[PDB]
Amino acid sequence: DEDETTALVCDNGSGLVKAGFAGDDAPRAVFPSIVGRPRHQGVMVGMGQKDSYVGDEAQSKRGILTLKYPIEHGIITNWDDMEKIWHHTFYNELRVAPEEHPTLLTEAPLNPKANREKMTQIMFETFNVPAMYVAIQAVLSLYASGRTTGIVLDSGDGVTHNVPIYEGYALPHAIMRLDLAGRDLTDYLMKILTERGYSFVTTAEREIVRDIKEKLCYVALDFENEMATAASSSSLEKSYELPDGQVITIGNERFRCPETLFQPSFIGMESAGIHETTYNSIMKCDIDIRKDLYANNVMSGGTTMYPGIADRMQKEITALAPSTMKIKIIAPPERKYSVWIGGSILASLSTFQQMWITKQEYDEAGPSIVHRKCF
Amino acid sequence: DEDETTALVCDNGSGLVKAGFAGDDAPRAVFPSIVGRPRHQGVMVGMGQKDSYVGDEAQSKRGILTLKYPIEHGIITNWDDMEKIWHHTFYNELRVAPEEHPTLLTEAPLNPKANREKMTQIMFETFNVPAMYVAIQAVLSLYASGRTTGIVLDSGDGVTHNVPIYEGYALPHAIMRLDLAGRDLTDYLMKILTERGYSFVTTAEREIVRDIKEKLCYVALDFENEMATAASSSSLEKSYELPDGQVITIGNERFRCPETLFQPSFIGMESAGIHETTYNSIMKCDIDIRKDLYANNVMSGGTTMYPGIADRMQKEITALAPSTMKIKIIAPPERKYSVWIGGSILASLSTFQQMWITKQEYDEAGPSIVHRKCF
Amino acid sequence: DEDETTALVCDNGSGLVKAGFAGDDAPRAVFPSIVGRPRHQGVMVGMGQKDSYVGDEAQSKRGILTLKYPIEHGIITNWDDMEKIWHHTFYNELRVAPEEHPTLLTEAPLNPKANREKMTQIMFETFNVPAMYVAIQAVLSLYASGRTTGIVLDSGDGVTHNVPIYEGYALPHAIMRLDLAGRDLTDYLMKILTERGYSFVTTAEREIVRDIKEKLCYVALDFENEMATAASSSSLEKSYELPDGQVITIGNERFRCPETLFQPSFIGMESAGIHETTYNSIMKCDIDIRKDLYANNVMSGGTTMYPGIADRMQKEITALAPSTMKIKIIAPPERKYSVWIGGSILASLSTFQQMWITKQEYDEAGPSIVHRKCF
């Protein structure tokens, strides 16, 4: 017990952190990974004039901020903010003490040697956690699927990826990435709205554009019919209500914004997203593994979650792929949190006492062991 | 004992003083802060030529006096009138010997350094009280509400005020004063009662119109339905008996005077009243305030008390505010007295023996220490 | 002539409307966008029961009326009120027959388009104007500067904006609206005056504090020093007398409010103010047009007319900008009407007989052709 369920899992995600204990099905703490600092002196009536707090406190909610998004594009960018974040992860969010709990964290698909180490320097030297672990975001998604071989295509908030997996780890020459994903299409949804209207330009009109992404967005299975069919009498017309009585008629719009992730092109770079990108990821992968991977293409993230995406993947990657390979997407129900759940199962596991990085090993060898125990 | 409840508390309020001791629920002395002086060499009563009268004395004998008001616009203008008043406060009202009682005097929330220092001068250097404290009114009103988390919107008699507090650090650029309040409203009630027919000609016809305000009046929860239906058959008629048996019927007048505190404007520019003035005791500074403020919006003072003001505030700030904030007003029972009460409870506090400004601290260091021990 | 001078222009701003004819240097009608409605049945001196008043006439009757603001944040939220405004704009304000008059009406930087079109319905279907145009406000401020290319910051009433225009094409991907502007930076100044020493009595006096910003208010070149400096001996001290004998000794206040536009502050509204939000508008638009953006940064609008604001802008954006790139503000003398002057010239234009959206095209194809004629 004392290790086995007290183990923690804390996905440092591209916009939101997911923390908890191990062997929980779904995260104990979820928060926008943002800290900031005063542009002016200012107090309320409350307690004592503090320097920086974190998350939904400073995001739903950021006036005197200088917003720092310290984990940009899934690689922890600022470490004074990150530390404050983990302080908030324990002594606010999980209501626990660091020296008591081993932690499992996730990292970037190409997290550099020394950043993985920088994580480990802080987690022992300020946080003093008794044991710890960090595993790559993608391997944990395929592990939440529970397949040892495959190809994960992660398009969460600030990063799109493709990582083959076969019997244990990843393949960095195949591994694709893209810096435009779950965020970038929400603002773009505001454009397509602001070609319809909209107008959404308060903060409270901008952060609701986000939610309209989550509901009203679809991925068009054939844009040729659909876009044109929207403008007759038809359907496509849906609506939302504002904080007041104004209806938000959105029709010939709903499907335009996800389509982007299925061909992001922009004047003198072509940022080919989701599909051809798998074919070229697997075409850099092992030739004997390819077959399985064609059938074991799995998705994860916020912006893999739009309605229509799986069918849309199913037709597309096939048209590209060599017709003897039985191809098939695995995009499970829980695929916005899978990165974490893989972690949870990876910690509450009878074998895992071997794979912990401990107190002692750290003092003896220093952070490079956390690289060498991984690969 | 020798300090504890020998400790005095004395609110210098814009028209009214509240003196007393530490550890009392309700003020021991209360008087109208008028200073009279005869316009005639009139050898008076059981003692002949008197230079002055203070409190109700000055209010009876007005016809022979000139009336002075030292705490005008929140602050201590002339220090001979003040000192006369405090001599009345101790040597007449409280009946104490000044040299055995620590005092607490209050201070107007934008009380200049030297003005705090000048209360500090007179208490020790002439009154010779062994110890003292000067206290930011909105911090005493705060405390009394069992909270340090809560924005005082003081609106007394000659003052409106919104002061936000960081455990003492009362923000020096969100604090507000706005002098249109209980006095402006009383003269308004006279005005409207005259349009109605009536003649508030003499002093005996004039000071009754104040008390009518204090009790018979209301704040509309919507000004349409009220200020239409009242002019018919309906309700809303109330009546007062005079110094004689002539009844004074008030119906379309009653609820206009408190309404004023919310909505002036006519034609020109763009400005605020209570609600918008609390929407910019909002827009000011700190990132991690807000969620506290909107839910913990307090009120205090003489012109806060008229029936309807809480529910009227509660709709109003909410329509202005972005609709993710859980908003809630707080308007306590005793809210023309809180200013003193939390004062009193703050002097009978076990933590306070560091805080008292003493004889010695003053002979060693002198005046500024009262400010420097606080802000 | 028959088209040329008889063309109208009517900038529907978030508080004030600006109207007139083609060619004219300065607007023929400037009115408050106040539809006021009665809470009463009754008759005025010589005039019977009307359902509404619009502009100044409504404002004068406040006590008996309910006011609304239909063009909140720049966007037409209620169409009963809007239609009432335009009906007043022709049949009262511009004193002409609409069916003889092409009209040019502005629209917010990213307006609604279902609303550009709803505006296109009412103007033909009820006001039968022979032709008309709807024009993007900020594009008309760069058009008052006679340029095809430049980034425009328009901070008018409850509108603040950043628009990058390249060769007559307003890039919707960088367009900020901020929601702290000419109003918000008055209502606050209102009360800091009152903190010091003031009050505003009854139904009218709220609306003197825009004139106070527009005349007195300074943008300090350093806030830390100036804050202390004001409270020493120093200067800052000047005074404004009322329409009665109350002097407004404002000194220590005068600089604090224009400063707000260089980073508005509280919590549930991010507002990196003026400087960073331009940088983050420009950096959404490409380098080969960034050279023309940094040289061609523009400001129109009431509150960007501040004493200090150009010089402050000049230091403040440059501290964020990549260092060799040459910057200079385009903030011309007439920058509180520019939006209408863009319109007036754009009607008085030899080429425009192809660019009128005609009587006929409307009956054949309907409203969206007015957005499709724009692009």
Swiss-Prot record, chains A, B, C:
One Gene Ontology MF term: calcium-dependent protein binding
Posttranslational modification: Oxidation of Met-44 and Met-47 by MICALs (MICAL1, MICAL2 or MICAL3) to form methionine sulfoxide promotes actin filament depolymerization. MICAL1 and MICAL2 produce the (R)-S-oxide form. The (R)-S-oxide form is reverted by MSRB1 and MSRB2, which promotes actin repolymerization. Can be mono-ADP-ribosylated on Arg-177 by SpvB of Salmonella spp. This modification blocks subsequent polymerization and leads to cell death.
EC numbers: 3.6.4.-
Modified residues annotated as N6-methyllysine in this record: 84
GO BP, one annotated term: actin filament polymerization
PROSITE patterns: ACTINS_1, ACTINS_2, ACTINS_ACT_LIKE
The keyword Hydrolase is annotated on this UniProt entry: yes
Protein name: Actin, alpha skeletal muscle
Record organism: Oryctolagus cuniculus (Rabbit)
Gene name of the record: ACTA1
